[PDB]
Amino acid sequence: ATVQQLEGRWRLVDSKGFDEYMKELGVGIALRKMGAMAKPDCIITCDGKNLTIKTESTLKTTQFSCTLGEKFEETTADGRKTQTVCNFTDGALVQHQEWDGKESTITRKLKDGKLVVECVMNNVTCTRIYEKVE
């Protein structure tokens, strides 16, 4: 219902589809193996319309900040530089990425006290579930 409801440190507890989604992105084997193996934490913080999402692991550490509704240049973990925009719509944070004629979307929602992250590119989907670290 509100973006602030997504705030906190979250730890990955389940993943489905992520290897296939990275293959759709064209990520090479070194990076795909590290994504299959890392169990990162996701730390979400917000202040009004400003949002930061940090991903932390020994295998993988990255962060971006944005303002809801404002396009910005995002450097992704696999090294794309995308034009991204985040919006909070219908109780989910929606992150839309565009680069080189391609698009992908990541949604983040709270369900049963867990953070549910879904990604899609060209109908190839991933679903990752995180629980709060507290």
Question: In the complex, which residues of this chain contact ligand NH4 (CB under 6 A)?
Answer: 16-17
9 is in an annotated binding site: no
Nearer to ligand NH4, 20 or 78 (CB): 20
37 C-beta neighbours (distance < 10 Å), count:
11
Shortest Å, Cβ 74 to ligand NH4? 25
128 is in an annotated binding site: yes
Shortest Å, Cβ 17 to ligand NH4? 5
29 is in an annotated binding site: no
70 C-beta neighbours (distance < 10 Å), count:
12
CB 104 within 8 A of CB 97: yes
Q: Which residues contact 100 (CB under 8 A, 6 or more apart)?
A: none
Of the candidates 60, 68, 55, 22, the one whose C-alpha atom is nearest the C-alpha of residue 38 is: 60
126 is in an annotated binding site: no
Q: Which residue is nearest to ligand NH4 (CB)?
A: 16
| Residues of the binding site | 42, 108, 128-130
